[PDB]
Paper text:
Holliday junction resolution is a crucial process in homologous recombination and DNA double-strand break repair. Holliday junction (HJ) is a four-way structured DNA intermediate formed during the homologous recombination. Canonical HJ resolvases introduce two symmetrical nicks across the junction center by functioning as homodimers, and exhibit strong structure- and sequence-specificities in HJ cleavage. The RNase H-like enzymes, including RuvC and MOC1, typically feature three or more conserved carboxylates, known as the DDE motif, in their active sites.
HJ cleavage was initiated by incubating the crystals in a solution supplemented with 10 mM Mn2+ ions for various periods. The first metal ion rapidly appeared within both active sites for approximately 15 s after soaking in Mn2+ ions. It aligns with the A-site of the two-metal-ion mechanism proposed by Steitz and Steitz30. The single Mn2+ is coordinated by the pro-Rp oxygen of scissile phosphate, the carboxylate groups of D115 and E257, along with water molecules, forming an irregular coordination geometry. In comparison to the ground state, the binding of Mn2+-A triggers a notable conformational change of E257, while the other residues mostly remain unchanged. The second Mn2+ emerged at the B-site by approximately 75 s. This sequential metal ion binding within the two sites might be attributed to the more solvent accessibility of the former compared to the latter.
Author numbering:
A (entry chain B), B (entry chain A): 109 to 271
DNA sequence: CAATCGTGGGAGACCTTTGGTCTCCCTGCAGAT
DNA sequence: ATCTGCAGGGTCTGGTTTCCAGACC
DNA sequence: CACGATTG
């Protein structure tokens, strides 16, 4: 039936698949905040919760969420934000009645044969245009890869296959 | 009327202050989970949300939460965990109808004179015992420092003063 | 189970299959149009 | 406003402040 | 602070 996919990161997105085959994808809401005399994007908690309350996906719907897995060579700040974004989404999803299943990125990539691409982001947008042709207008910019990760995650939990 | 204090860490706690002067403090609910073939404690999102749902504190109540601010000499795992707890708690608090106010540890410590102690944790329990005498038995143990921090954050937003 | 200490650290999934291998982001910031 | 590239990074309060001291998990 | 470890 209904499936939710969540790319939890700052350029990420939430994708919702209804049982009639239609689909929605939203950019993750963010705000600009001061940290240590610079400005930085942080997910917008209030907006995210308002969004999750405006979905028609019923309680108990499974939200598939990409497990943040920072590399040992990423910075401590990178570790912090990805932990923070992840906790914010998990808690907002659990609080809004949705069932949360974390999925490793290697899981949904191998499912769609996206492993070992020279152009992984480009390829994700292309595979999501294929799976969701009405969204292809909304998938043409490189910055849109996060929308494509969400849609693909949702595609994975829903069982869809590339043609 | 009502004030909430949150020490969002694994050994932290949530403290709720009534207008009638009573107080409760709960340990943060955790679960043991597998990470990279070892066992690690993580906050329990479902138990947290349930706890927040059963509190008498009415909506709009302010929760004062300690800003996580890890040290640069702390490891990337510490940065990830603190960021995640923080995000889990903020999101759970906003979804439970409460208004979240982040408070740095320098701020409430300065407020209660706790700065630059040799035994910061002991002093916190002692200060929380003086402010919440009926919690005196809940602060006997050295591992009870999280209950203290949580209570002191709530006393801070409450405008309480030491004798 | 309650304290203490000391350094600061990947994690995941699937095969080669009980370990060995291999794969995966992101943040933050500085120039680039 | 989108892009790219590349290394991996503290953050906070407050001061008779315009950066910096001194503090914190 | 986390993360492992020891030590009661
Ligand atoms: Mn993403
Ligand atoms: Mn604490």
């Amino acid at each position: 039936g209904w499936v939710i996919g969540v790319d939890p990161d700052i350029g990420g997105a939430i994708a919702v698949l209804s049982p009639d085959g239609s689909s929605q994808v939203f950019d993750n809401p963010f705000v600009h905040i001061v940290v240590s005399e610079v400005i930085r994007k942080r997910l917008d908690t209030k907006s995210i919760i308002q969004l999750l309350r405006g979905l028609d996906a019923p309680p108990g719907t499974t939200a598939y969420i990409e497990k943040s897995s920072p590399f040992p060579t990423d910075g401590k700040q990178g570790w912090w934000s990805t932990g923070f974004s992840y906790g914010l989404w998990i808690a907002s999803l659990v609080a809004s009645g949705f069932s949360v299943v974390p999925i490793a990125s290697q899981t949904w990539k191998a499912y769609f044969g996206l492993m070992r691409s020279e152009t992984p982001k480009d390829d994700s947008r292309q595979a999501a245009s294929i799976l969701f042709p009405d969204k292809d207008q909304s998938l043409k910019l490189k910055k849109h890869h996060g929308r494509a990760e969400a849609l693909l995650l949702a595609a994975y939990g829903k069982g869809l296959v590339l043609p």
